[PDB]
Amino acid sequence: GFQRGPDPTVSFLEASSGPYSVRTDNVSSLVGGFGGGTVHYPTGTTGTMAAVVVIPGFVSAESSIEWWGPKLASYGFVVMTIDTNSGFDQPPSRATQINNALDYLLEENDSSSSPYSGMIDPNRLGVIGWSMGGGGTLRVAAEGRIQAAIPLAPWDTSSLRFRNIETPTLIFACESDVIAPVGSHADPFYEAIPDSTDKAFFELNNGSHYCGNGGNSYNNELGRLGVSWMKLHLDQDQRYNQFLCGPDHEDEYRISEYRGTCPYLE
Numbered sequence: 721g722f723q724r725g726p727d728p729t730v731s732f733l734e735a736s737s738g739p740y741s742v743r744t745d746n747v748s749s750l751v752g753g754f755g756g757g758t759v760h761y762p763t764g765t766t767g768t769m770a771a772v773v774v775i776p777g778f779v780s781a782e783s784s785i786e787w788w789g790p791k792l793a794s795y796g797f798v799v800m801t802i803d804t805n806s807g808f809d810q811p812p813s814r815a816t817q818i819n820n821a822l823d824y825l826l827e828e829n830d831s832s833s834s835p836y837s838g839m840i841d842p843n844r845l846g847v848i849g850w851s852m853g854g855g856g857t858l859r860v861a862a863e864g865r866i867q868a869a870i871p872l873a874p875w876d877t878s879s880l881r882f883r884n885i886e887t888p889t890l891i892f893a894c895e896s897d898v899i900a901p902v903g904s905h906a907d908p909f910y911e912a913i914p915d916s917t918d919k920a921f922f923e924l925n926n927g928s929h930y931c932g933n934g935g936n937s938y939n940n941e942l943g944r945l946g947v948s949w950m951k952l953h954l955d956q957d958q959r960y961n962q963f964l965c966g967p968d969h970e971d972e973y974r975i976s977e978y979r980g981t982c983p984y985l986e
């Protein structure tokens with residue numbers, strides 16, 4: 721079970737939005753302990769669905785990760801994007817921020833009066849995180865609480881904390897990144913994760929540190945692979961395996977390197 725929506729296609733995944741109209745709930749920084757944000761939830765749906773937190777992690781970023789909110793929610797997820805300039809900073813504080821954001825969603829889910837009351841299945845939680853938020857994502861993945869992880873241009877001080885990650889993890893690396901150079905961050909972080917774990921490494925060709933944030937030159941890749949990652953691992957929706965295990969990913973112009981442990985869900 722957990723499957724939702726029609727048989728997927730590339731065009732279905734690369735469209736500017738998914739099928740479901742999306743409504744929003746603004747969360748003040750006064751509540752939650754995670755810096756405020758916006759809950760994106762689909763309309764017209766039935767049943768429960770997975771929840772995803774999307775967290776930034778670049779102090780004085782020029783832009784953020786908001787694209788993921790409406791994009792992912794429109795394929796059947798409750799997706800909260802966290803605001804920037806929250807007082808959190810380094811990867812350990814960002815793990816706390818993620819945990820507080822997840823608590824908040826579950827708390828509102830358990831409320832009878834939330835606009836998305838009862839929409840979330842608490843057993844199916846994912847996190848997408850950028851920069852030091854990506855280091856925080858990998859740290860929460862290592863804590864064992866989540867069911868899928870997408871670090872975006874992750875930054876952290878060490879890879880040793882990630883040597884036991886069992887959470888399905890897709891790292892988007894940005895080839896030309898000078899903030900979190902791939903060779904010192906996304907690459908060794910990916911290689912630290914055991915080869916028994918369902919994982920993938922997608923380096924985006926010529927990408928700056930912002931390349932994974934979406935609403936940019938990489939929409940096709942981030943949507944096609946990122947939505948598929950969450951459908952496959954949070955919904956156990958085998959219909960999305962085709963986009964992740966099978967294609968010659970590096971043949972794509974936008975993808976300068978691919979690594980992975982296909983097949984998944986063995």
Ligand SMILES: [Ca+2]
Nearest residue numbers: 895925926976
């Ligand atoms: Ca290049």
Ligand SMILES: [Ca+2]
Nearest residue numbers: 981982983984
């Ligand atoms: Ca495998």
